[PDB]
Structure formats: structure tokens, C-alpha cells
């Protein structure tokens, strides 16, 4: 991005919910970003399930994921969530953030190839230690809100070191809201509830194609109570509504 | 396509509205489809703005449309609807059905290439008589709901004579509803009102990707009054809701 500025007026949406967090919002045409908190926008957190984005791309590139119509079959064995115990498309596996599906993808990719792609994508601190299947969730990988929007911008422009076809496939799998004036592409993440003194993190990252403009966004918050999880969409949604971007 | 089977339980959605029309729905593939009217399912009509689907693909294949982020700039001159009087992306032009954007694309494609691709796509009667920029609106081009679902299935499967890349670009531009469990890709068409004795046609065609299943659909109806237009979505939406698809 070209520039960033602090805009403390969005803070009302955070303080109304007693939330500690950050929103980064970038306008494509101007290359300019605004955040409520410049310091936090640069702080690096576990990507949790937002890692499913580069994971999906890498799985495609390596041929671990065959094509966009790949069905990931439930093997029948009891999974960690009820919603994962079923056959899933790529979009399906992305949306229920099916840990087991993506853990298997990452296993098949392997450390060497995973590290190569993460380096090429300039994705986070690029540190993959703690298990080839658990590094993003309870291992060492860390990424900032600013790095999330830069990465998503490169994905939007097909600029990642991956085929255009594979980036297109992932971009469509990420569609989460369609309106006549705008398309929202997005991904949630949630590391867990941590402790009160060491909270977990919740994310919502993505971009809005709005008429001929595009807006890149990344939100994160401290979270110690699963009841607060819906705020990870509601705060950035209210901000984007107030910005005249969505709602619409 | 494969086989088409009459489903009389859908008639009530048409008679409740005094609508003459057809719904074709195919689960997994066009190998077997269901319909309310066997004769009408294969009857061919002006495609009107449903033609924007092949037009967008052909525009991309020929390089007339540079890439997926091309912006179609408004020149400031009057266009037939106010919603077309602005710069538009490919998705934008599709979603608002920006006739003049697609007319200029068609002119640049030209008749020879246009004909070639309609043949490759088996798009309806493949007849482009009537003017390069209007054959789909007032000319001789005709396509049936059965053929719409075959064409959409080929697009879905990236089996059209076009790059996978350009088929994906057009598919994304067609997304009209996103939910956790499904994605709807769709396109409307409306030829006009004609007369009582020679009505226009209204269309709604597309596919639903639900869980690990896919449903191809095509709807058309006779229309002679513009106030009836919302029915081209509500009739098929009601049918698909009752089937538990959406």
C-alpha cells in the first residue's frame, strides 16, 4: 500500500462493545489505508483460519487440491465439530474452517514447499514451526493486519506466485456476500479463548469490490469469551456501512 | 439433453400468478432434467440480456475485453437507463445489464467471430441476423430453457471453447447470491412487452452450488406488462425453496 493514516473516530464502534482491536481499511485506487490504531495494525497475531487462504492457493498450486470442484470426503471418523462431519467443497471447507481438511492439505504440501510459498507470498513472519498442521493455530506463524491487506491485494490482482487460474478459484471460494453494487470476499479466523491475561485472537479479513472501487480490509480483536465472536464481523461491518461501502 | 421429465407439482406457482412459462431444473448434470412443461422447455426464445453470458466469454476470448479488471468507462452520453450512466466493471455491467457496453463489445467482436463462437457453444439456433449489436434483442437469435442449462453446465465445468481463466472470470461476474451453504450464479433477460397477442419474454437462468451438489436452472415466461417482471425470479425461487435447494 502507498500510505496509512490513523482515524480514531472508528473507535466508537470498539469502545461501545468494550473491544480491544484494530480495523485496517484500504482504498485501491488511492493506495491509501486508514486504521483506528496504527500500532496494533502492525502487531502480528496467529492467522488461525485466515491461513486457509494461502493454504488453499498452495494446495491448488502444488496439485494437492485437484481443482475447484474437489470434494473433500468425510472418512466417517468422529471430527472435532458437528459441521465438519460431512463431504465438503473447497468453498464448504473454507467456510466451516474445517481444520481436518486443511490439516491434511498442509500435511501433503509438506514443510519445504509450504515455506517456499509463504516466503514468496511474503506471508507473515513466515515461521512454520510447531507442526505442519498446527503452526497457524497453536504454533509460531504470526501476521499483522497491514500484512493481511497487502497479501489480499496481491491475491486480488493475481500477483501472487501462483497461476492466475488458482488465484481466481480461491477468490470465488471466498465470496461471502453478493449485492448488485458490490461483492464481499472474506475469511474469519479464531485462535480460541486463551486466558483473561493472554486472550485469543479473532479475525475477519477480505475485500469489497464496490462499483469500480475496491476496498481491502483486515480486522482483529482480543477475545476471551466465545460469546463475543460475532463482534469480529459486526464492528468492521458497521464501520464499512458508515463509510458508505456496504449496506450498500 | 439427456431426458426431460414433467413435474406437475410446479404448475401451482404459475397458475397462482396467471403466468405462461417454463422452469427447467437439473440436479448434478443435464443427463436428466425436470420441468412443468415438456413442449415449452425446448421452445426457443429471444435470449435478450441472458446473451451477456456468451458475449462476456467471447469478449474475453477475442481480447476485446482485456482482463477481469477492465473498467468500461462512461463517455457522458445519454444511455437508455440511468443505471448504465457510469463506469462499470464486467460484473457491474452484467448485473445492471448494461446493453450499450455489450453492444460495443459485440461490434468489436464482429460478425465472423461472433458466429464462430455461437457455433462452438451450440448457443440456440446460432442465428445472428438482425444487426451485430441487437440480434439478441430484436433479431433472429432464439434459445430454449433446455439449451440454457446445457450451456451453463458447460460453463460451470469449464468445458466451453474458451480458456478456463475466462470461464472463471465470467462465472465470478455471475454470482448473485452467497450464503453459507450455497452460491447462486444467475442472469436475467427481458425482451420487452410486445403485444397481448405477441408478448415479450422474461428470463432467469443460472445454477446453484449447494453443499456438494449443483443445480442448473432456466426460467422463462411470456410477459406483456412490466409490472409482472419480478415473477421471473419469484416463481423459480419459490420452486427451488420448495425443493430445498435455496
UniProtKB/Swiss-Prot annotation, chain A:
Keywords carried by this UniProt record: Antibiotic resistance, Disulfide bond, Hydrolase, Periplasm, Plasmid, Signal, Transposable element
Keyword Manganese included in the entry's annotation: no
Binding site for a beta-lactam: 97, 188, 190, 232
Activity at various pH: Optimum pH is between 6 and 7.
Catalytic residue positions: 49
Top class in the EC scheme: hydrolase
UniProt cross-references to Pfam families, sorted A to Z: Transpeptidase
Disulfide bonds: 26-33
Biological process terms in GO annotation: antibiotic catabolic process; cell wall organization; response to antibiotic
Xref: PROSITE patterns: BETA_LACTAMASE_D
Similarity annotation: Belongs to the class-D beta-lactamase family.
Subunit structure: Dimer.
Main function: Class D beta-lactamase which confers resistance to the beta-lactam antibiotics, including penicillin, carbenicillin and oxacillin, and also some cephalosporins. Confers weak resistance to some carbapenems, in E.coli strain C600Z1. Acts via hydrolysis of the beta-lactam ring. Has penicillin- and cephalosporin-hydrolyzing activities.
Name of this protein: Beta-lactamase OXA-10
